[PDB]
Amino acid sequence: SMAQRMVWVDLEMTGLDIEKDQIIEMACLITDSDLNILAEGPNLIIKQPDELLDSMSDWCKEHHGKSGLTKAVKESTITLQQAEYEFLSFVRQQTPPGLCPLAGNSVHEDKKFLDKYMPQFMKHLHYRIIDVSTVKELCRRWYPEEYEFAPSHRALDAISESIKELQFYRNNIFKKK
Amino acid sequence: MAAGESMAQRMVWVDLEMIIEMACLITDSDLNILAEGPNLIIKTITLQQAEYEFLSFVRQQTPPGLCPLAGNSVHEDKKFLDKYMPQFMKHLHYRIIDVSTVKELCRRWYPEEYEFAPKSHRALDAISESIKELQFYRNNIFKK
Ligand SMILES: [Mg+2]
Ligand SMILES: [Mg+2]
């Protein structure tokens, strides 16, 4: 039951460089094994210095500017430690320790950034992941017709769409019972 | 399909076992093995030479940036390779085909079929087992 819950997480960062870039937005949801959303967790924008934001890549600067994320990061007073406190408290109240997997689209990158910057949060979770993008690639290869009809760079919207994408895959390309 | 799409839908299967043994091969979109790559030992050669070997192989086998890494819990292997074989990883897509994801989905949604699924320490045998496991999943829990 609770051991089969999933911890869905999406991150927005200043870039892909794990050695230099930081987390600027994070959202978390808790679903059961049937993808029913059980709990909506914190949706936080994490304060980061102005120099890193002004030094972002062209893709990151353009997109995080058009979405208003850069201005929100400039506006935020939430540190990385406070964000980890909130997320750790949420998952500790929602999941049993060490049994539930991270979930999302290409969530291995999010797992890299969380292992580096939120290690206690990741210590609460299982080591396996549920990568929706794996199912996406398998659907693109084996079910192109269904893939064509499958369903803002902000964390909450992205993770909601990830859950819906996996639900579409289960409804359309997995064996009916 | 259009010319080149079947090649763009190939998979680069890799496995690493800890002295580190590393093996790699290529499958088509239907999991048929097309070519076997190097099977190397790194700390009988150096990391840079082994990276060159694997990169030359995947250059001969997949178009740049289009094909994903594949394997069981391949995210850990990708974490290692992004740091120690970055030129090899730059040839690959950023998405992965994690057989462990399908394994978890089968355990949750198809437990009866899950009890029948396939489950040495050499990397090539691990790749073979991962391919057979994904094929079992396609045969038994995916839409006919
Ligand atoms: Mg995402
Ligand atoms: Mg996003």
Residue numbers in the entry:
A (entry chain B): 38 to 188, 193 to 218
B (entry chain A): 33 to 50, 60 to 84, 114 to 189, 193 to 217
From the paper:
We obtained three complex cocrystals, referred to as Rexo2–RNA (Rexo2–D199A bound with a 12-nt U12 RNA and Mg2+), Rexo2–DNA1 (wild-type Rexo2 bound with a 5-nt T5 DNA), and Rexo2-DNA2 (Rexo2–D199A bound with a 10-nt T10 DNA and Mg2+). In the Rexo2–RNA complex, we used the inactive D199A mutant for cocrystallization with RNA in the presence of Mg2+. D199 is one of the metal-ion binding residues in the DEDDh active site, but we still identified two Mg2+ ions in the active site, one bound to Glu49 (A site, MgA) and another bound to Asp47 and Asp147 (B site, MgB). However, several regions in protomer A were disordered, including residues 51–59, 85–114, and 190–193, in the Rexo2–RNA structure. As a result, the RNA substrate was modeled only in the active site of protomer B, but not modeled in protomer A due to the ill-defined electron density. In the Rexo2–RNA and Rexo2–DNA1 complexes, only the last two 3′-end nucleotides were observed, i.e., U–U in Rexo2–RNA and T–T in Rexo2–DNA1, with the remainder of the substrates being disordered. RNA-specific interactions are observed in the Rexo2–RNA complex, where the 2′-OH (O2′) of the ribose group of the 3′-end nucleotide forms a hydrogen bond with the Met50 backbone (O atom). This interaction likely facilitates product release for nucleoside monophosphates, so RNA is cleaved more efficiently than DNA. We propose a hydrolysis mechanism for Rexo2 activity, based on comparison of the structures of the two active sites in the Rexo2–RNA and Rexo2–DNA1 complexes. Thus, Rexo2 hydrolyzes the phosphodiester linkage from the 3′-OH end by means of a two-Mg2+-ion-dependent catalytic mechanism.
Human RNA exoribonuclease 2 (Rexo2) is an evolutionarily conserved 3′-to-5′ DEDDh-family exonuclease located primarily in mitochondria. Rexo2 degrades small RNA oligonucleotides of <5 nucleotides (nanoRNA) in a way similar to Escherichia coli Oligoribonuclease (ORN), suggesting that it plays a role in RNA turnover in mitochondria. Rexo2 forms a homodimer and interacts mainly with the last two 3′-end nucleobases of substrates by hydrophobic and π−π stacking interactions via Leu53, Trp96, and Tyr164, signifying its preference in binding and degrading short oligonucleotides without sequence specificity. Rexo2 contains four strictly conserved DEDD residues (D47, E49, D147, D199) for binding two metal ions, as well as a general base (H194) in the active site for hydrolysis of the phosphodiester bonds in nucleic acid substrates.
